Design an enzyme around this catalytic site. Structure first.
Site, PDB file in Angstrom:
ATOM      1  N   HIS A   1       0.774  -1.242   0.000  1.00 51.24           N
ATOM      2  CA  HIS A   1       0.000   0.000   0.000  1.00 51.24           C
ATOM      3  C   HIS A   1       0.801   1.284   0.000  1.00 51.24           C
ATOM      4  O   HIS A   1       0.240   2.316  -0.390  1.00 51.24           O
ATOM      5  CB  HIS A   1      -0.959   0.154   1.191  1.00 51.24           C
ATOM      6  CG  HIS A   1      -0.596  -0.582   2.439  1.00 51.24           C
ATOM      7  ND1 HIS A   1       0.587  -1.274   2.583  1.00 51.24           N
ATOM      8  CD2 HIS A   1      -1.023  -0.335   3.706  1.00 51.24           C
ATOM      9  CE1 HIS A   1       0.646  -1.732   3.821  1.00 51.24           C
ATOM     10  NE2 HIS A   1      -0.270  -1.114   4.541  1.00 51.24           N
TER      11      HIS A   1
ATOM     12  N   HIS B   1       6.084   6.957   6.422  1.00 49.97           N
ATOM     13  CA  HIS B   1       5.592   6.539   5.111  1.00 49.97           C
ATOM     14  C   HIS B   1       4.847   7.712   4.503  1.00 49.97           C
ATOM     15  O   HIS B   1       4.657   8.746   5.152  1.00 49.97           O
ATOM     16  CB  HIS B   1       4.651   5.336   5.209  1.00 49.97           C
ATOM     17  CG  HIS B   1       3.459   5.619   6.060  1.00 49.97           C
ATOM     18  ND1 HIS B   1       3.466   5.477   7.432  1.00 49.97           N
ATOM     19  CD2 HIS B   1       2.266   6.174   5.745  1.00 49.97           C
ATOM     20  CE1 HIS B   1       2.302   5.881   7.917  1.00 49.97           C
ATOM     21  NE2 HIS B   1       1.554   6.302   6.913  1.00 49.97           N
TER      22      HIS B   1
ATOM     23  N   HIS C   1       1.527   9.082   1.681  1.00 53.66           N
ATOM     24  CA  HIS C   1       0.318   8.926   0.881  1.00 53.66           C
ATOM     25  C   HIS C   1       0.402   9.940  -0.250  1.00 53.66           C
ATOM     26  O   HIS C   1       0.789  11.083  -0.015  1.00 53.66           O
ATOM     27  CB  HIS C   1      -0.908   9.220   1.747  1.00 53.66           C
ATOM     28  CG  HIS C   1      -1.018   8.327   2.947  1.00 53.66           C
ATOM     29  ND1 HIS C   1      -1.603   7.079   2.898  1.00 53.66           N
ATOM     30  CD2 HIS C   1      -0.502   8.449   4.194  1.00 53.66           C
ATOM     31  CE1 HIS C   1      -1.520   6.507   4.086  1.00 53.66           C
ATOM     32  NE2 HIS C   1      -0.839   7.311   4.886  1.00 53.66           N
TER      33      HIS C   1
ATOM     34  N   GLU D   1      -4.218  12.995   2.905  1.00 57.77           N
ATOM     35  CA  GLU D   1      -5.374  12.442   3.591  1.00 57.77           C
ATOM     36  C   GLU D   1      -6.132  13.513   4.353  1.00 57.77           C
ATOM     37  O   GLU D   1      -7.343  13.665   4.170  1.00 57.77           O
ATOM     38  CB  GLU D   1      -4.948  11.316   4.534  1.00 57.77           C
ATOM     39  CG  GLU D   1      -4.306  10.182   3.751  1.00 57.77           C
ATOM     40  CD  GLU D   1      -4.267   8.884   4.510  1.00 57.77           C
ATOM     41  OE1 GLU D   1      -3.735   8.805   5.638  1.00 57.77           O
ATOM     42  OE2 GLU D   1      -4.814   7.925   3.950  1.00 57.77           O
TER      43      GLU D   1
ATOM     44  N   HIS E   1       3.662  10.817   7.063  1.00 54.66           N
ATOM     45  CA  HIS E   1       3.252  10.394   8.403  1.00 54.66           C
ATOM     46  C   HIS E   1       4.452   9.797   9.116  1.00 54.66           C
ATOM     47  O   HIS E   1       5.010   8.796   8.653  1.00 54.66           O
ATOM     48  CB  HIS E   1       2.138   9.353   8.327  1.00 54.66           C
ATOM     49  CG  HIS E   1       0.839   9.908   7.838  1.00 54.66           C
ATOM     50  ND1 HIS E   1      -0.192   9.115   7.367  1.00 54.66           N
ATOM     51  CD2 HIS E   1       0.386  11.178   7.803  1.00 54.66           C
ATOM     52  CE1 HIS E   1      -1.218   9.884   7.046  1.00 54.66           C
ATOM     53  NE2 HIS E   1      -0.896  11.140   7.306  1.00 54.66           N
TER      54      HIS E   1
ATOM     55  N   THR F   1      -5.247   5.407   9.505  1.00 60.70           N
ATOM     56  CA  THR F   1      -6.031   5.600   8.288  1.00 60.70           C
ATOM     57  C   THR F   1      -5.974   4.398   7.354  1.00 60.70           C
ATOM     58  O   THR F   1      -6.519   4.461   6.245  1.00 60.70           O
ATOM     59  CB  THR F   1      -5.584   6.841   7.516  1.00 60.70           C
ATOM     60  OG1 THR F   1      -4.258   6.651   7.014  1.00 60.70           O
ATOM     61  CG2 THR F   1      -5.649   8.100   8.408  1.00 60.70           C
ATOM     62  N   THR F   2      -5.303   3.328   7.753  1.00 58.66           N
ATOM     63  CA  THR F   2      -5.339   2.055   7.049  1.00 58.66           C
ATOM     64  C   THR F   2      -5.860   1.004   8.015  1.00 58.66           C
ATOM     65  O   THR F   2      -5.743   1.167   9.231  1.00 58.66           O
ATOM     66  CB  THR F   2      -3.941   1.643   6.576  1.00 58.66           C
ATOM     67  OG1 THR F   2      -3.080   1.576   7.720  1.00 58.66           O
ATOM     68  CG2 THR F   2      -3.379   2.656   5.579  1.00 58.66           C
TER      69      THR F   2
HETATM   70  C1  LIG Z   1      -2.037  -3.697  14.636  1.00 60.65           C
HETATM   71  C2  LIG Z   1      -0.838  -2.817  14.266  1.00 60.65           C
HETATM   72  C3  LIG Z   1      -0.882  -2.032  13.118  1.00 60.65           C
HETATM   73  C4  LIG Z   1       0.209  -1.238  12.804  1.00 60.65           C
HETATM   74  N1  LIG Z   1       0.236  -0.401  11.608  1.00 60.65           N
HETATM   75  C5  LIG Z   1       0.869   0.898  11.730  1.00 60.65           C
HETATM   76  O1  LIG Z   1       1.344   1.284  12.743  1.00 60.65           O
HETATM   77  N2  LIG Z   1       1.090   1.847  10.692  1.00 60.65           N
HETATM   78  C6  LIG Z   1       0.777   2.198   9.339  1.00 60.65           C
HETATM   79  C7  LIG Z   1       0.080   3.315   9.556  1.00 60.65           C
HETATM   80  C8  LIG Z   1      -0.392   4.026   8.536  1.00 60.65           C
HETATM   81  S1  LIG Z   1      -1.278   5.449   9.148  1.00 60.65           S
HETATM   82  N3  LIG Z   1      -1.824   6.237   7.758  1.00 60.65           N
HETATM   83  O2  LIG Z   1      -2.419   5.154  10.009  1.00 60.65           O
HETATM   84  O3  LIG Z   1      -0.393   6.273   9.963  1.00 60.65           O
HETATM   85  C9  LIG Z   1      -0.132   3.714   7.224  1.00 60.65           C
HETATM   86  C10 LIG Z   1       0.621   2.579   6.966  1.00 60.65           C
HETATM   87  N4  LIG Z   1       0.858   2.333   5.551  1.00 60.65           N
HETATM   88  O4  LIG Z   1       0.163   2.840   4.743  1.00 60.65           O
HETATM   89  O5  LIG Z   1       1.974   1.598   5.134  1.00 60.65           O
HETATM   90  C11 LIG Z   1       1.120   1.800   8.037  1.00 60.65           C
HETATM   91  O6  LIG Z   1       1.881   0.648   7.798  1.00 60.65           O
HETATM   92  C12 LIG Z   1       1.333  -1.264  13.626  1.00 60.65           C
HETATM   93  C13 LIG Z   1       1.382  -2.026  14.769  1.00 60.65           C
HETATM   94  C14 LIG Z   1       0.292  -2.810  15.082  1.00 60.65           C
HETATM   95  F1  LIG Z   1       0.346  -3.578  16.207  1.00 60.65           F
HETATM   96 ZN   LIG Z   2      -0.300   7.192   6.864  1.00 59.67          ZN
END
Ligand SMILES: Cc1cc(NC(=O)Nc2cc(S(N)(=O)=O)cc([N+](=O)[O-])c2O)ccc1F
Ligand SMILES: [Zn+2]
Length: 257
Positions: A61, A91, A93, A103, A116, A195-196
């Site tokens: 993504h 990362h 968007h 976003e 972000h 947001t994901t």
């Molecule tokens: C259940 C669980 C989920 C996560 N996922 C996470 O932290 N981050 C992530 C956040 C966004 S965002 N847009 O919300 O900041 C966008 C992307 N992405 O798009 O790659 C991400 O990979 C981390 C630990 C965890 F235990």
């Molecule tokens: Zn993000």
């Protein structure tokens, strides 16, 4: 599973992640005339001088740069936050055209991309525990507009060829995230979500007022990444943004007059 397509995109996510229709979902539109200046908010404290970047990876993504979060090396504190939050990854968007891709929006204005920087609250011991808590994560959001080049971004731009497709990663050491910050740390803040998927409602959002400028050639290289894995049909990774969600019973606060 989920993605940003016609058949698996944000309007479908609630079927697998019903919190998508929850009470503190992100992103939101920031209406600058309804935001509340709050004088009790403290300045942000961004301490990134000791940051240790590790890897850069295409996760299907977006692409992310990961950091060593085993010690307090790169931390965020102050602002609306209680306690110390460690930098985990950053990362982006972005859009298919320069008029879309962020976003969050500001008075309905969309930016070309949004950065972000994801941080987690060290009181919870590990990031998996943090995502279960209403104050578990703090995400610093920075808008990108197209204009002059951002020299601190070029080293990210130059390695993207090596992570073109889903699942590829590469060593990405000695990167200094201070090169991605605007001059001013004035900000808006509100309680929100990832947001994901899984869209967990664990995030204090800190969205900076001042965008950074990137060149058209820099953002074009974002648009050359692929959602697909190697050996599959090529879909360009573009428009990996979630549209704004209802503010519901929340107040957006501003750190500045
Ligand atoms: C259940 C669980 C989920 C996560 N996922 C996470 O932290 N981050 C992530 C956040 C966004 S965002 N847009 O919300 O900041 C966008 C992307 N992405 O798009 O790659 C991400 O990979 C981390 C630990 C965890 F235990
Ligand atoms: Zn993000």
């Amino acid at each position: 599973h989920w993605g940003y397509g016609k058949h698996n995109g944000p309007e479908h996510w609630h079927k697998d992640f019903p919190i998508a229709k929850g009470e503190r979902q992100s992103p939101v539109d920031i209406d600058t005339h309804t935001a509340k200046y709050d004088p009790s908010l403290k300045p942000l404290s961004v301490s990134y001088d000791q940051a240790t970047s590790l890897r850069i990876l295409n996760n299907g993504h977006s692409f992310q740069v990961t950091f060593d979060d085993s010690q307090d090396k790169a931390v965020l504190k102050g602002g609306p936050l209680d306690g110390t939050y460690r930098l985990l990854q950053f990362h982006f968007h972005w859009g298919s055209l320069d008029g879309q891709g962020s976003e969050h929006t500001v008075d309905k204005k969309k930016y070309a991309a949004e950065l972000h920087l994801v941080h987690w609250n060290t009181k919870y011991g590990d990031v998996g525990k943090a995502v279960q808590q209403p104050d578990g994560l703090a995400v610093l959001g920075i808008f990108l507009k197209v204009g002059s080049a951002k020299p601190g971004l070029q080293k990210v731009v130059d390695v993207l060829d090596s992570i073109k497709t889903e699942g590829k990663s590469a060593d990405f050491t000695n990167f200094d995230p201070r090169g991605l910050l605007p001059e001013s740390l004035d900000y808006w803040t509100y309680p929100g979500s990832l947001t994901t998927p899984p869209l967990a409602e664990c995030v204090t959002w800190i969205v900076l007022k001042e965008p950074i400028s990137v060149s058209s050639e820099q953002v074009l290289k974002f648009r050359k990444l692929n959602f697909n894995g190697e050996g599959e049909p090529e879909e360009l990774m573009v428009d990996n943004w979630r549209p704004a969600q209802p503010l519901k019973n929340r107040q957006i606060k501003a750190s500045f007059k």
